[PDB]
Amino acid sequence: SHRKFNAPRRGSLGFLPRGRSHAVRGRVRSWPKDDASQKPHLCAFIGYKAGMTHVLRDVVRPNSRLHKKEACEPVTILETPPMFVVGIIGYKPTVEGLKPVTTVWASYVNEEVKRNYYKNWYQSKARKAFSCLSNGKAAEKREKQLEELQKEATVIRVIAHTQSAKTTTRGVDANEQGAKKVLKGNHLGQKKAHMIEIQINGGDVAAKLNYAKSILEKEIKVADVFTEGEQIDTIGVGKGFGWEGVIHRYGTKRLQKKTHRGRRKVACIGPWNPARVLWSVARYGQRGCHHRTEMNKRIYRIGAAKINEGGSTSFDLTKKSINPMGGPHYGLVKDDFLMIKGSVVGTVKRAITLRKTININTRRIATEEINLKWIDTASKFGHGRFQTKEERSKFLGKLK
Amino acid sequence: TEICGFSGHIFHAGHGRVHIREDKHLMAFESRKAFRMWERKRNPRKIAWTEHYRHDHKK
Amino acid sequence: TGQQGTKFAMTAGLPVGAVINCCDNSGAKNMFIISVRGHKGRLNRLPAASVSDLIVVTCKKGKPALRKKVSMGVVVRQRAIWRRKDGVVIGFQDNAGVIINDKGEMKGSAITGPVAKEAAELWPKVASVAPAVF
RNA sequence: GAAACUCUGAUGGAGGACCGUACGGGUUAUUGAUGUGCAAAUCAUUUUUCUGAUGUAGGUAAAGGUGCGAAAGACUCAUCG
RNA sequence: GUGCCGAAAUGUACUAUCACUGAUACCAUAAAGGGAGUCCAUGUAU
RNA sequence: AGGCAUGAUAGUUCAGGGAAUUCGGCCAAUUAGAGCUGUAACUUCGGGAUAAAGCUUGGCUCUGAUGAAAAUCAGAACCGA
RNA sequence: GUAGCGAAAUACCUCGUCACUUAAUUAGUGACCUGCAUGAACGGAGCUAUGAGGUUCUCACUGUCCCAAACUGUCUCUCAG
RNA sequence: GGCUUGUGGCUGCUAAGAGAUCAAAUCAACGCAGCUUUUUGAUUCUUCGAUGUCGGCUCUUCCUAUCCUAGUGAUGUACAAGUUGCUAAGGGUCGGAUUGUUCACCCGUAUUAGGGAUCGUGAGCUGGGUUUAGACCGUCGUGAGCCAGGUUUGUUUUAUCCUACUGGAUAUAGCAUCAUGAUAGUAGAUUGAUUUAGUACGAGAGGAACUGUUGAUUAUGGCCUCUGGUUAGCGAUUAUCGGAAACGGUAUGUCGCGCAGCUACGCCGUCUGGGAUAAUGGCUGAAAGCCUCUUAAGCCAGAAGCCCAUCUAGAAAGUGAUGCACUACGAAUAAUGGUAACCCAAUGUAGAAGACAUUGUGUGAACGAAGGUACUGUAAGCAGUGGAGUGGCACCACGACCUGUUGAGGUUCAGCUUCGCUUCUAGGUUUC
């Protein structure tokens, strides 16, 4: 043909434009269609990406070559602290789209939520936001608005934010009433909370306003949203790399070595007519920091965090904590966690929003037996010889 | 767990590498550091950091 | 034809015109590999054998009876490292293969040196005569 | 060794011999850099020659349908059928 | 030339047309050859 | 004075394969000094020839030979990545 | 048109015909000769030595390539002039 | 390039027969009618104060006259492999040997089509060919010279301008968070083995299929746990210089190993159902008292194609929720001041500049400590019935190196983790 040879297209056309996303967390596009009936049951939940190990699973697949054999599998580990419900929204259906019918708020609001409505907290003397404390306006107002949500709004979503949690300053010894208290940050830094909104897929609408009002001003944990064996979609922003050449960005073949003005380029931008560069053509620009979803990530185990028996499995009868000895770029993980199979989008420290998958697998890998023999807790700097500190003294008890 | 050929340390599953020798030796290794010092026909009795050193060197 | 099974996607070490040793006593000192059997087209990509790949070869150095002919090999040891799903990473000291007929019966009597696991696990006749499997 | 002479080792230092230096003489390749040059012919790495038919300085001879040319229509003050 | 863009009757009277189709000289292309699609129709027999 | 992504240019290094790249091994890589072996077809008998192909080379403590000579050559221990 | 040479740095037809070379050769080498248009100081046949000369293959070695990647020096980026 | 289509390519109409018998399963003469601009002609309209001329390399998009994949009908269709018609351009269409080649021709593989975009693509490359000046051969010419006859050596310039495209910012009708989602793009596609099965079918030879399971190739998005590549952190070492050693310089030093970071040769995801259609197959049923998928009304089944679902961007679609701040039925139409932001100061979750993100009295930064963690591989100095030996006094000199102190010493966030009041934290301008 005219091309002179046939070879697939370089790079996907559906993930344009390849530019930066300014979202700090995974913005959810579309929630699963409500089954209707059943129970409302929350869907999405935020977890921070803590790090990564591998695990030695023992496999049970009938009619395959790995029947009753061991299989090493990489595992990301998202830390998930239990997050706090605050608000509640309706959404009326209209000809234009879904449009909102007012948010109700809780009785008080924690000052982690007040951070969101300032860029300069440290300057602010008044710090007056959410002054819904006045008794006459707030109490009367909610029962008016909660009536309007029964009338109009079909879809109902629950506003909720991450617990930054509280502490005592420096050398004051903690657990004492005279001491002034203050917000501890995350493993990142931040005290300002990640507010989301979470669709409740429970039938009747009216039924939802029992559940979403029962859940209001109470912390949610992970164990009553997801369950072990669930396929989960991980939504987040990927890993920023700045500007990039045409060769590395789109994965093209670089030119001959003999080229004047260098070879790290696509040679023909285009033909004479049309007299114009096309959108389709590969080109120099941003790489990474792209918002992405990824489908069908299994969760192997769910955590809790003095016994510290979470790291260890049924076998061995030795208790090992999940954090690898020495902790890189993160923190210990003294919270609920999720051993997700394989990769998850974004760097360490990033807020990933999890989500239940939109439609169901029929693949047998989806409904497999999980059974972990044994997990790595060696250090990542760089080659790790000892799984635990306990091993150390026994292996080399006398030092200096 | 596998004990190494060179060095004589323990290491756990999903680490290191194996070089199957001629005359059918299955020799596991700790790292590239241990593999590379084996590849140049060096003794573990002379190299200090190893564990097979420290048996015959009396500690 | 005499595979009974399939591969598990190893690292491929042996692109076209990789001359390798022959384990068998048939009389092939070397085997200049031409193409891998069961390989699809792609622009500028050299087709590359790993272990347990039915390959097309010429014996270059050997007996005058065998050489200057096209024949079916099979790869046994790879030298380049690859990851088993178990987690272990394995390579050999040398590249080596053996010649087979169109039926999938082994032409030579017995193997010199070791063989890989998935070569034996796939091909039965190479497993049926080998000094050690790894 | 009958002889005519011819075997081994040293001595010797011949050759338009060979390898190889330079602020020497040339200018092969990268068809590299530069090509709004440092430069109206350069730079880097590589390459050729290096006691000779060698290089080079000053003085001196040959002048335009002429000069000179180990000859390319080469050169004759960035100018040459 | 007269639905609107666009000034001027989607004029009055009378016949055809269903097709991812047709639509104003020079002019911006289409033929030989087919069709119980529909309307109009020539000669005979029952 | 401050940054360090991309790209140009000059450089080290790259698993497995080893010219499949390309008009073309262009480029770069390998080889290399010295001592002791050992050197083919062909030849105008002068060459080829550093043909090719092997080995050894450090440090330290000594011993011996040749000179006038404070130098240079040969040999042996012991030492470690 | 003698001797040599002969699809040649000359052979259009032509990717001539038959071997060797390769897994595969319009290339390379050796034969045959209906030499479009070979040929003897218009010099013919020859290649020991020499060649920054032209061309084919084998061994060694390699980012030329499968298939790219990382790091380093000076610029490209920002500011003052 | 345009017009034209002889020539080249592609397709109709007709049948005179091939095809055992039988024109129309499949070929198709003698004729006749068209289409095409992917061949080459013909012409001289444009360009001679110059549109850089062949092929290859690299990347994009488009056409269908479909080879494969999706779905269907015919048959000289038993099976399988075939021949052939229709709808379909979403995806796929290749590694090499010689040749400058386009083309051709062989070896090999996952079965295997052809084209366009100034014969796409030279301020993107290459310069092998073609086409200068040097030179050789052969025929021709008295000669200078000639030759789609052959051979060899022969300079490939400029973007900093305007658009186009790629990413990133800034002005407006407050400040901030959380949302809606018009519109634009869209992604998965192929295939082996196994089960059904040596079964249906067939005299035998042979030899299927829907569905399920399980791998792979290729493309795509993401990741660094392992593995491999790279690496001024440690150690070793050549020549020389600092009186020796120590610890260093220089040769942008050489070798060995090497966290972090990036990266692939590594690792994970690619699920999944609608709606209306194209071909085509059906139902009921007239026209045509029979019969017909509609060539009529009505109804059903129906493609990898189109539109949705999913995923990427997104209110100059100048929008919205929440916080603070200043005048009337309906249906048919063969009917009823003071806030706030930004500067500034760090940090990194990120970066060319802008921006984005987080904090700014708090372990935030700087330092320090960890039987926290790494990398290197046993510091110096001292001691030794250690040590091939040589030299001297009546056991001391010089001695690569080895044993002990010593898994020591050095380095360890700069983009690593834990906790510690040791030390330090200030100002400036607009906005409604």
Side-chain angles (χ1 to χ4, degrees):
Chain A
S1 63
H2 214 228
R3 184 163 56 206
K4 162 56 178 197
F5 267 129
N6 286 308
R9 199 200 128 74
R10 299 286 183 185
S12 49
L13 210 48
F15 292 90
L16 303 185
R18 299 186 182 194
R20 301 170 186 169
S21 55
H22 299 315
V24 190
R25 48 166 207 77
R27 295 267 140 69
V28 177
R29 195 176 285 283
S30 71
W31 279 268
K33 296 181 180 191
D34 33 286
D35 322 358
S37 77
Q38 75 201 144
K39 277 42 198 165
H41 77 62
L42 296 162
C43 297
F45 202 94
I46 295 219
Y48 304 102
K49 184 171 155 173
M52 201 167 167
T53 63
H54 62 269
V55 69
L56 187 66
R57 191 161 65 76
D58 186 57
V59 184
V60 181
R61 291 179 201 172
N63 210 68
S64 186
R65 198 147 56 255
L66 311 178
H67 187 233
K68 303 191 184 294
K69 293 201 171 182
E70 298 184 308
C72 199
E73 294 183 308
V75 169
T76 53
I77 297 174
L78 313 192
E79 198 212 81
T80 48
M83 80 199 303
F84 193 86
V85 176
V86 159
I88 178 168
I89 323 180
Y91 285 106
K92 186 178 81 201
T94 68
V95 302
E96 199 154 41
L98 295 175
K99 307 296 178 195
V101 199
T102 313
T103 79
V104 183
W105 299 103
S107 58
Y108 69 87
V109 181
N110 193 7
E111 71 129 301
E112 290 148 46
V113 175
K114 292 177 190 168
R115 295 308 199 78
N116 283 279
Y117 302 89
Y118 302 103
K119 311 306 294 186
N120 298 289
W121 182 255
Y122 85 107
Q123 296 285 79
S124 190
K125 299 178 169 176
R127 292 174 181 176
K128 259 154 43 64
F130 279 78
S131 282
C132 75
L133 201 44
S134 310
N135 308 235
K137 170 183 176 179
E140 270 203 307
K141 178 183 299 308
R142 302 184 213 144
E143 300 300 310
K144 192 164 183 182
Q145 285 176 7
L146 288 161
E147 196 168 50
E148 292 169 48
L149 295 164
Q150 291 170 295
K151 189 172 164 278
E152 296 225 283
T154 59
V155 181
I156 286 154
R157 302 198 187 162
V158 167
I159 296 162
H161 78 280
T162 316
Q163 296 286 77
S164 194
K166 207 170 276 289
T167 197
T168 319
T169 192
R170 274 162 194 283
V172 174
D173 299 302
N175 200 63
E176 48 171 293
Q177 62 251 53
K180 188 178 79 186
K181 299 189 83 69
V182 70
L183 294 168
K184 190 68 167 166
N186 296 343
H187 296 280
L188 193 139
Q190 75 188 96
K191 298 148 191 196
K192 189 200 298 210
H194 294 310
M195 297 183 92
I196 65 175
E197 48 137 54
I198 300 160
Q199 178 162 306
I200 303 166
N201 275 349
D204 314 300
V205 181
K208 287 170 162 176
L209 294 165
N210 290 308
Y211 176 72
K213 200 190 294 190
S214 181
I215 209 83
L216 190 131
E217 210 191 301
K218 300 291 288 189
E219 68 173 44
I220 308 157
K221 288 166 178 184
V222 176
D224 62 305
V225 180
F226 303 120
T227 317
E228 290 174 14
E230 187 88 290
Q231 301 289 76
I232 283 162
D233 288 27
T234 57
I235 325 306
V237 183
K239 179 161 175 170
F241 297 119
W243 198 261
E244 198 68 63
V246 179
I247 301 308
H248 200 59
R249 195 183 187 199
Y250 284 85
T252 61
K253 187 161 164 278
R254 74 202 176 161
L255 309 180
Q256 293 250 302
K257 188 167 175 68
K258 302 169 79 209
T259 58
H260 191 234
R261 316 190 199 75
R263 62 156 156 182
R264 305 296 299 286
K265 56 182 76 164
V266 169
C268 308
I269 285 164
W272 198 316
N273 282 257
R276 267 185 310 284
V277 180
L278 309 173
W279 71 294
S280 61
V281 177
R283 193 57 67 123
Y284 297 84
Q286 173 60 206
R287 173 161 159 274
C289 221
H290 304 314
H291 178 70
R292 291 282 184 277
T293 73
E294 283 187 33
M295 319 196 79
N296 307 122
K297 304 291 184 182
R298 175 65 62 76
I299 46 157
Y300 278 135
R301 201 146 62 75
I302 300 160
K306 72 208 194 318
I307 295 64
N308 289 108
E309 165 265 2
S312 64
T313 70
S314 304
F315 306 152
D316 302 12
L317 296 174
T318 325
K319 281 52 179 177
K320 186 178 50 56
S321 317
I322 76 76
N323 308 280
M325 59 176 295
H329 289 62
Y330 189 76
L332 295 196
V333 188
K334 299 201 282 283
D335 280 293
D336 301 307
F337 52 75
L338 298 168
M339 272 198 293
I340 292 166
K341 183 177 77 67
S343 173
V344 168
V345 174
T347 56
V348 68
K349 311 188 197 170
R350 278 280 179 75
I352 285 71
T353 68
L354 303 146
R355 195 199 70 202
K356 290 184 177 157
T357 313
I358 297 156
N359 40 17
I360 307 159
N361 296 130
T362 61
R363 213 185 158 188
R364 302 205 184 177
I365 299 154
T367 62
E368 241 189 58
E369 192 183 55
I370 300 164
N371 43 311
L372 279 52
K373 298 192 143 155
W374 176 91
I375 299 152
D376 238 79
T377 63
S379 63
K380 273 131 251 298
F381 265 46
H383 300 277
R385 310 279 287 281
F386 313 61
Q387 306 297 272
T388 50
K389 78 159 187 182
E390 266 287 290
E391 293 205 345
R392 280 213 139 220
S393 305
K394 166 182 163 179
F395 170 101
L396 55 177
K398 323 178 64 58
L399 280 196
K400 75 109 294 287
Chain B
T1 310
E2 284 193 309
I3 301 157
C4 307
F6 194 86
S7 86
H9 298 106
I10 56 146
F11 69 102
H12 296 274
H15 283 272
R17 57 185 283 186
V18 178
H19 184 85
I20 300 156
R21 207 179 169 283
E22 294 189 308
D23 317 314
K24 67 159 187 293
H25 302 260
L26 189 75
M27 304 172 299
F29 288 101
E30 191 186 303
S31 197
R32 181 181 191 283
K33 189 202 175 61
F35 175 67
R36 189 61 164 167
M37 290 188 179
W38 185 91
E39 195 166 52
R40 301 145 169 178
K41 312 183 185 169
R42 309 220 194 286
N43 298 313
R45 300 284 289 285
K46 293 192 168 173
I47 301 298
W49 66 269
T50 53
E51 191 163 23
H52 198 55
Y53 184 86
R54 298 171 99 240
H55 179 59
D56 297 302
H57 214 261
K58 306 186 177 168
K59 43 168 174 273
Chain C
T1 315
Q3 294 201 309
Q4 295 177 335
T6 22
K7 223 164 62 160
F8 216 88
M10 298 168 266
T11 308
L14 294 81
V16 302
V19 57
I20 63 174
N21 295 6
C22 153
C23 314
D24 64 63
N25 53 319
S26 332
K29 198 180 283 290
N30 293 284
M31 291 199 299
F32 181 92
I33 75 103
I34 288 157
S35 301
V36 185
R37 198 158 287 181
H39 193 275
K40 214 249 170 133
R42 177 62 174 75
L43 195 72
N44 307 120
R45 185 75 62 80
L46 303 185
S50 75
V51 181
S52 318
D53 279 293
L54 182 51
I55 50 163
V56 184
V57 305
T58 52
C59 184
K60 200 185 277 165
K61 290 175 77 67
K63 205 161 274 286
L66 188 57
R67 71 176 174 174
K68 301 168 70 63
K69 300 283 277 182
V70 179
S71 294
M72 286 154 62
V74 67
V75 180
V76 178
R77 297 167 272 165
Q78 218 198 310
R79 204 215 179 79
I81 70 202
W82 75 87
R83 193 169 159 286
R84 292 204 210 287
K85 287 286 281 171
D86 191 51
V88 70
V89 187
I90 284 163
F92 285 87
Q93 204 173 328
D94 63 317
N95 293 266
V98 294
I99 300 156
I100 58 177
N101 63 9
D102 291 47
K103 301 296 293 193
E105 304 291 303
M106 195 174 141
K107 203 184 80 64
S109 300
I111 306 285
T112 307
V115 308
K117 187 163 161 54
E118 56 254 289
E121 195 178 359
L122 185 60
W123 298 86
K125 298 283 162 290
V126 177
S128 192
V129 273
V133 183
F134 288 108

